[PDB]
Amino acid sequence: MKLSDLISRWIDVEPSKNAQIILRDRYFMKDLDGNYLETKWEDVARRVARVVATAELLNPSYKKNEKLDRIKEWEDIFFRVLKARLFIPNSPTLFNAGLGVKHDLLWKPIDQMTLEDYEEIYRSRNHLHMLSACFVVPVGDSIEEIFEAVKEYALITKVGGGVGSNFSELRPKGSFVAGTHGKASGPVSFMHVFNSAISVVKQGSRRRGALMGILNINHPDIEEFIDAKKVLNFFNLSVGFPMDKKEILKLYEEDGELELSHPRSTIRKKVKIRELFRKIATNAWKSGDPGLAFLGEMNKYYPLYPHRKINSTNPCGEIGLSDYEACNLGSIDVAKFYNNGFVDLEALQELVQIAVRFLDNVIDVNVFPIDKITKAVKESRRLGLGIMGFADLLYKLEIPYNSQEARDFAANLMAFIALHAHRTSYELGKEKGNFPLLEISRYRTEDNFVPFAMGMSNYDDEIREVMKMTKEFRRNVALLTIAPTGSISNIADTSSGLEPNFLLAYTRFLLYVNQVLREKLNPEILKRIEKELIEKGSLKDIPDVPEKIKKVFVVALDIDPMDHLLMQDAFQRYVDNNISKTINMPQSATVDDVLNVYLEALRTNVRGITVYRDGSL
Amino acid sequence: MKLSDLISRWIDVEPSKNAQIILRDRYFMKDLDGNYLETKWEDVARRVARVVATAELLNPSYKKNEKLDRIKEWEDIFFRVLKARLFIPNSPTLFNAGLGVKHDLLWKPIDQMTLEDYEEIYRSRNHLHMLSACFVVPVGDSIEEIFEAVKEYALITKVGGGVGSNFSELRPKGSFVAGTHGKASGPVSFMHVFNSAISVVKQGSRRRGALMGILNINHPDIEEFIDAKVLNFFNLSVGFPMDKKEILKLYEEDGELELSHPRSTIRKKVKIRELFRKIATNAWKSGDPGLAFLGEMNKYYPLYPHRKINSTNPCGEIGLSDYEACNLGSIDVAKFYNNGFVDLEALQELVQIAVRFLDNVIDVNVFPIDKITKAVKESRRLGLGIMGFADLLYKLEIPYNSQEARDFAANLMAFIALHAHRTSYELGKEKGNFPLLEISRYRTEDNFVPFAMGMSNYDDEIREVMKMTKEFRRNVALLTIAPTGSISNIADTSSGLEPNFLLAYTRFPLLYVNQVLREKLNPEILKRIEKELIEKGSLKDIPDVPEKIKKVFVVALDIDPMDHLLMQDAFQRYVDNNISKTINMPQSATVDDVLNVYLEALRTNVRGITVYRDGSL
Numbered sequence A: 001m002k003l004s005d006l007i008s009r010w011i012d013v014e015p016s017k018n019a020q021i022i023l024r025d026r027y028f029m030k031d032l033d034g035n036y037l038e039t040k041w042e043d044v045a046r047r048v049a050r051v052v053a054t055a056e057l058l059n060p061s062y063k064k065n066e067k068l069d070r071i072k073e074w075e076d077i078f079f080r081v082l083k084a085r086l087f088i089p090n091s092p093t094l095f096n097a098g099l100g101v102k103h104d105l106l107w108k109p110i111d112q113m114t115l116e117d118y119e120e121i122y123r124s125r126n127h128l129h130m131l132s133a134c135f136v137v138p139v140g141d142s143i144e145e146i147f148e149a150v151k152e153y154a155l156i157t158k159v160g161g162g163v164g165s166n167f168s169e170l171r172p173k174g175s176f177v178a179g180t181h182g183k184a185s186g187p188v189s190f191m192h193v194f195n196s197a198i199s200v201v202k203q204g205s206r207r208r209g210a211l212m213g214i215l216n217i218n219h220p221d222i223e224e225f226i227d228a229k230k231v232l233n234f235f236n237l238s239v240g241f242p243m244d245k246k247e248i249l250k251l252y253e254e255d256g257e258l259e260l261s262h263p264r265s266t267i268r269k270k271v272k273i274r275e276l277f278r279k280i281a282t283n284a285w286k287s288g289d290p291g292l293a294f295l296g297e298m299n300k301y302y303p304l305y306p307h308r309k310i311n312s313t314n315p316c317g318e319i320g321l322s323d324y325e326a327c328n329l330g331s332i333d334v335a336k337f338y339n340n341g342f343v344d345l346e347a348l349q350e351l352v353q354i355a356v357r358f359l360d361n362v363i364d365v366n367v368f369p370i371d372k373i374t375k376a377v378k379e380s381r382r383l384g385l386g387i388m389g390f391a392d393l394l395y396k397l398e399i400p401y402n403s404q405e406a407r408d409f410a411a412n413l414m415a416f417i418a419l420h421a422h423r424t425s426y427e428l429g430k431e432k433g434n435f436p437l438l439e440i441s442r443y444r445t446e447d448n449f450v451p452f453a454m455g456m457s458n459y460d461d462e463i464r465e466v467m468k469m470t471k472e473f474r475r476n477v478a479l480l481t482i483a484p485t486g487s488i489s490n491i492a493d494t495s496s497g498l499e500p501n502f503l504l505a506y507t508r509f510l511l512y513v514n515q516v517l518r519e520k521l522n523p524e525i526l527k528r529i530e531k532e533l534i535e536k537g538s539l540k541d542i543p544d545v546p547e548k549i550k551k552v553f554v555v556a557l558d559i560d561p562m563d564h565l566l567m568q569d570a571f572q573r574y575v576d577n578n579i580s581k582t583i584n585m586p587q588s589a590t591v592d593d594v595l596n597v598y599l600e601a602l603r604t605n606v607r608g609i610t611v612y613r614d615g616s617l
Numbered sequence B: 001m002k003l004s005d006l007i008s009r010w011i012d013v014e015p016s017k018n019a020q021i022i023l024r025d026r027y028f029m030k031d032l033d034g035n036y037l038e039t040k041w042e043d044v045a046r047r048v049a050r051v052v053a054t055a056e057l058l059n060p061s062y063k064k065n066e067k068l069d070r071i072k073e074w075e076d077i078f079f080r081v082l083k084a085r086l087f088i089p090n091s092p093t094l095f096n097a098g099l100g101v102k103h104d105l106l107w108k109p110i111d112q113m114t115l116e117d118y119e120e121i122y123r124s125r126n127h128l129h130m131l132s133a134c135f136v137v138p139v140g141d142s143i144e145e146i147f148e149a150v151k152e153y154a155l156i157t158k159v160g161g162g163v164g165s166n167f168s169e170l171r172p173k174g175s176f177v178a179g180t181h182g183k184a185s186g187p188v189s190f191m192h193v194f195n196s197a198i199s200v201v202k203q204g205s206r207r208r209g210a211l212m213g214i215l216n217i218n219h220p221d222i223e224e225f226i227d228a229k230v231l232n233f234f235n236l237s238v239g240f241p242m243d244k245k246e247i248l249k250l251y252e253e254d255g256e257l258e259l260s261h262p263r264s265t266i267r268k269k270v271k272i273r274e275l276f277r278k279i280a281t282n283a284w285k286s287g288d289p290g291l292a293f294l295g296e297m298n299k300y301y302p303l304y305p306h307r308k309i310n311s312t313n314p315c316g317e318i319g320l321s322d323y324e325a326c327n328l329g330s331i332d333v334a335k336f337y338n339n340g341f342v343d344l345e346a347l348q349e350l351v352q353i354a355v356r357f358l359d360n361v362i363d364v365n366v367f368p369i370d371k372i373t374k375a376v377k378e379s380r381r382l383g384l385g386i387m388g389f390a391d392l393l394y395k396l397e398i399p400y401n402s403q404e405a406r407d408f409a410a411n412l413m414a415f416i417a418l419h420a421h422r423t424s425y426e427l428g429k430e431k432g433n434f435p436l437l438e439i440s441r442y443r444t445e446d447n448f449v450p451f452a453m454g455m456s457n458y459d460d461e462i463r464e465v466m467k468m469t470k471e472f473r474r475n476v477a478l479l480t481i482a483p484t485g486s487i488s489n490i491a492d493t494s495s496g497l498e499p500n501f502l503l504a505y506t507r508f509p510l511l512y513v514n515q516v517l518r519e520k521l522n523p524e525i526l527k528r529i530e531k532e533l534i535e536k537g538s539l540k541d542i543p544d545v546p547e548k549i550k551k552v553f554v555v556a557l558d559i560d561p562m563d564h565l566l567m568q569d570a571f572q573r574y575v576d577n578n579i580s581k582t583i584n585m586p587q588s589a590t591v592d593d594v595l596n597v598y599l600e601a602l603r604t605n606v607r608g609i610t611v612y613r614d615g616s617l
């Protein structure tokens, strides 16, 4: 089907009452006095579409004679996709698009727009006009650098960004400080100061701070870091693995020792890698932190490595970012692409093309609080196009999430999306110009570079061809991710990212009940079991429910840890950034079960791991 | 007698074993390996003398044919007075003098010094070469300014400075934040972040952070601030930017104060008497917060209103404009006792030397922040003070708690003020005026004097000297009395203007007895009463101790609060900066007694108040 007709199917489907509450609470724009300027999702769609379309003012392929018509066309397509909720950008684009701009320009009819209206929108974007969710900054090994980084954290938090750092540059606790002849406090002590700062800074009531803190496995304070969370409430924590996954796996299998050391310290120590892993697994089993960040694996696929280097991810791990780099995200609701037993790839390809252009335009109208960030982003133009609604799409296709069928399906879907996204980046490089660093990247200096593992789709050869093409034209260093979509999946009334539904019937702080199950399950057998379902949190052992329904409508805890993990692998094979995935584990899971997840993760193509044991906290 | 004669009596007297412990612990310089580069006080005196004498390189009055000669002469004189411990600069001068300089230059014999050697010292002072104890920085009402100030606190603390701020620009808790449509955390919440930052920064083993936080009496969060003590690195003082007379009048009338802020809409009225009682109650319990009479400080500030004092450093003794710093040094007046009188001949010569020393410190000082370098160069504020005052009173057989002592104090301080300012005149003539002389009240007024006077017959001469400095003046202000918490130990003498807290106690088991008490008391009686003296902490109730001994050898708690306060007044009349003075109060004091001290303070010439009730903490 043509995308335009899929749009018609969804564009007048109104957000649920639950979605509308979320929108009214945090998304609808207000004036200084607190009056609503927006009252409907339609309003947000218009504002956002208009602001993002204005980036086309910079399009060198457009003559000044045609710019108005072209800009209006893009605003129109952006608006319709947004209103239909087929694609939604990360929350900050929704919150902040249009800040600074006159209120009589943001929602005026598109056919009344002039070239001057668009130029005024473009010129009037203020210093708060921050549209990207993901940031990384360095934390250098000096008081000057540390406290500058604290300030950066505050500035980023204020405008609504999530920020991460690798703290491994900071010399270990007890290390000599030549300036004062003193002893260093160590990275963990400094992280507490970052936490205290973020306790008093936020984007009002819209968005509290969200941080990632990584410390590398061979840092002498790694043991303290692993135990740090039991304070650091604004931090997610992961252990960094800068080395090859295969090197760490080999060390483990051979029961080897890791040398803990630091370039600006005499503090040295040998520890058994098995013991370190058991310590991590033990803490993860207890409380869910810390995760694992396979930085070496991120750099293996980073087109600018080794001249640039990924040392950290943003808060939910989905983007590996070089120093001062930021990234803007957006997600396609693939559940809306279900049609008569299949995914409408005709419509999907069209949307992928539009989505990549949209996200790339966001860069041009984005305003950052720090010049080094503005520059890093301009030079690389990293994007994070993902999906949401995947679990619900499987429901409609009658495919159990915990099956090889679903994983083969996932790989082919993500391969298809990657193919067309990268083809779009080629076309965009040709039209608007290549990202400034193309020439020094592996797309250029190397033959056969591909920014992911592939290996589970028939699209592989076509993907290889397109990667070769991007030696000459490429708008973006990387294009894909899968995010948690913690908010935007709720606005879209669909399942979150690649995650299975956590529950088929529940209440959040009200009542949510899976729309796809409503449509499949007979209302008789539904009214019955309803209570039992909300109490057991699964269909698994509710008697008198068709075996067919039970197998399809699985929830997170119905799906064993390895099936969670292998699904992450299927997607990561066709994602050039990373992926947010929780490996849910049953309350009855052991520390050794966690260790087994880690070892299996080391053999798969995943770039990081987060585990959460039911009943943990 | 001539100063040279007094130097001879003291120069070969080595510091007590007690002092040597302190020196070895944190004053003696070490190499990167931790080996001592200094092992005797005279080594410190050599290094410090040589570094500060190096400033004479910049003296425009010297011909190059004499520059070596002059520099050597000043190094020699500085060395002699330091070694003799007649005058000692603030700790950071002793800690940091010479950092960056090749070790073969700091201690070699002065007869081996060439002009090139001094130029080399001057060139190689590094970024840690910070020689001043007292700082103030502003904290502006924005996230950017707040966290820039946090960084400034860290940098200052690293090099061993003490820093204060007035936090009143920060809008009250709950105030609107336009950029986020949020609510402000308020100053007290942000002070916690400053405290957390300073918990992980220090000048090695030498000294931890030391901070002052002030909030003005009319700030809407004043009541929360008053109860704020989590803030362990802060001393707190309530700021009074209005005239002392105005607040006394409001108190006497049982009037109300309007609490308001420029960046907030909510105003509140409170009884000034209720506010004062809240302050007195907390100070009675815990010793905080103090009172800072900012308006009284600006009354005597030569640059007001062009420049403005909003805060003091940690112990309150210097009122500083934004980004201003000040270096201190104190003369041990106990060593000037001679046959029933103070030796004014020798003391005058030393005041002249110490003022030149302190002014030279500025030329070889390195600050961490450019705005501080600029503010210091423009004003050249100094803080020359005294220590050993209590022991001098002992030798003179004058009870600290008497009008006699207070009259003596005023006369002594007037003499010092007179000759310090005379020296600043001469220095202005020789080296050049401080750049802001022209816009100062020494120039723009008739009859400006930077203190109240009124208790000395030196007043007329002081008036004449201030008039002369209309034409020449090296320094905006010259005088303070500091706690001397460390340098009075090094000099083996009483601290600042404070009475001795105790006459005898046990060091580590070593019995210490005040040296003067030992010389005046019959050794037999001493051995007899020692036990009871340590137990009771005073001679007053000990039987068979001569009445005259009891009256003369008073300690802090023998002296009533009003007698502490009036001594502070006597000094403050002839000090152009402020004074560190603890108003000790007996454990049996009431909150009403504290209130009465506050009210008497408003009637006196004191510029601030700190009280401490014995046994409260």
Ligand SMILES: Cc1cn([C@H]2C[C@H](O)[C@@H](COP(=O)(O)OP(=O)(O)OP(=O)(O)O)O2)c(=O)[nH]c1=O
Residues within 6 Å of the ligand: A141, A142, A143, A144, A170, A171, A176, A177, A178, A179, A180, A182, A183, A184, A185, A186, B158, B200, B201, B202, B203, B204
């Ligand atoms: C000064 C100081 C540093 N540190 C830590 C912070 C950094 O991680 C590390 C270095 O701080 P720096 O500010 O670089 O100290 P320095 O440059 O004077 O000493 P060096 O030449 O040895 O680098 O030490 C503390 O933990 N506490 C302190 O007081």
Ligand SMILES: Cc1cn([C@H]2C[C@H](O)[C@@H](COP(=O)(O)OP(=O)(O)OP(=O)(O)O)O2)c(=O)[nH]c1=O
Residues within 6 Å of the ligand: A158, A200, A201, A202, A203, A204, B141, B142, B143, B144, B170, B171, B176, B177, B178, B179, B180, B182, B183, B184, B185, B186
């Ligand atoms: C952003 C933010 C500010 N503040 C406080 C810090 C400052 O005291 C005060 C101003 O912060 P600013 O950073 O100056 O906020 P703003 O410029 O976006 O808004 P405005 O025009 O109203 O100034 O608000 C918070 O307490 N929490 C926050 O999250």
Ligand SMILES: Nc1nc2c(ncn2[C@@H]2O[C@H](COP(=O)(O)OP(=O)(O)O)[C@@H](O)[C@H]2O)c(=O)[nH]1
Residues within 6 Å of the ligand: A089, A090, A091, A092, A133, A134, A135, A157, A160, A161, A162, A163, A207, A208, A209, A210, A314, A315, A316, A317, A318, A329, A483, A484, A485, A486, A487, A488, A489
């Ligand atoms: N500052 C801040 N950033 C967040 C928060 N939630 C998410 N982010 C950022 O947004 C990224 C994507 O999260 P996602 O759940 O997909 O956000 P959504 O766009 O709001 O649905 C995260 O990795 C963070 O970088 C938050 O509560 N605060």
Ligand SMILES: Nc1nc2c(ncn2[C@@H]2O[C@H](COP(=O)(O)OP(=O)(O)O)[C@@H](O)[C@H]2O)c(=O)[nH]1
Residues within 6 Å of the ligand: B089, B090, B091, B092, B133, B134, B135, B157, B160, B161, B162, B163, B207, B208, B209, B210, B313, B314, B315, B316, B317, B328, B482, B483, B484, B485, B486, B487, B488
């Ligand atoms: N950072 C820091 N500053 C201090 C400390 N003690 C004193 N200061 C600063 O030095 C000033 C004078 O204090 P004083 O006791 O006379 O210092 P001394 O030279 O060490 O004897 C104080 O007002 C503070 O500004 C400390 O422990 N740490």
Ligand SMILES: Nc1ncnc2c1ncn2[C@@H]1O[C@H](CO)[C@@H](O)[C@H]1O
Residues within 6 Å of the ligand: A236, A237, A238, A288, A289, A290, A291, A292, A315, A316, A317, A318, A483, A484, A580, A581, A582, A609, A610
């Ligand atoms: N170290 C971490 N701790 C908690 N959540 C993490 C971590 N790293 C990535 N995440 C992601 O953040 C989200 C937490 O709700 C999930 O998507 C999860 O996969």
Ligand SMILES: Nc1ncnc2c1ncn2[C@@H]1O[C@H](CO)[C@@H](O)[C@H]1O
Residues within 6 Å of the ligand: B235, B236, B237, B287, B288, B289, B290, B291, B314, B315, B316, B483, B580, B581, B582, B609, B610
């Ligand atoms: N608010 C305050 N102002 C000045 N000194 C204080 C204050 N609080 C405690 N003190 C202590 O009192 C002495 C100086 O008055 C120093 O020891 C200092 O640390």
Ligand SMILES: [Cl-]
Residues within 6 Å of the ligand: B589, B590, B591, B592
């Ligand atoms: Cl009482």
Ligand SMILES: [Mg+2]
Residues within 6 Å of the ligand: A141, A142, A143
């Ligand atoms: Mg350094």
Ligand SMILES: [Mg+2]
Residues within 6 Å of the ligand: B141, B142
């Ligand atoms: Mg502001």
